[PDB]
């Protein structure tokens, strides 16, 4: 019957939408890898920033290492 053949033909009309859905799925699986690599980027580039920005970005936890040299002069 024409009706059934029409339904079967039309079953795949929306190919592009299904492909967009596929884009969404694979990117959802992939994108969390940005966190490891982001941490490492920041790890490497932290000692390049100004001392003030190092102190700020760590909420004051980070401070200049104390190795027993270059102390104040009376």
């Amino acid at each position: 019957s024409r009706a059934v053949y029409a339904k079967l033909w039309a079953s795949t009309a929306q190919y592009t939408q299904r492909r967009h859905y596929a884009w969404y799925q694979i990117w959802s699986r992939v994108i969390p890898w940005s966190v490891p690599w982001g941490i490492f980027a920041m790890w490497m580039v932290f000692p390049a920033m100004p001392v003030e920005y190092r102190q700020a970005l760590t909420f004051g936890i980070w401070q200049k290492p104390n190795i027993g040299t270059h102390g104040p002069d009376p």
């Binding site: 009706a3 079953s11 190919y15 299904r18």
Partner: peptide
């Protein structure tokens, strides 16, 4: 004795109404 077959006559119909009797089918 052969069975007494019932007749089924041909009739022509509007496809857009026959399409309301088609089962639902999905591939995507």
């Amino acid at each position: 004795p052969a069975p007494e077959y019932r007749r089924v006559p041909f009739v022509k119909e509007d496809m857009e109404k026959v399409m309301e009797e088609v089962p639902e089918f999905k591939y995507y």
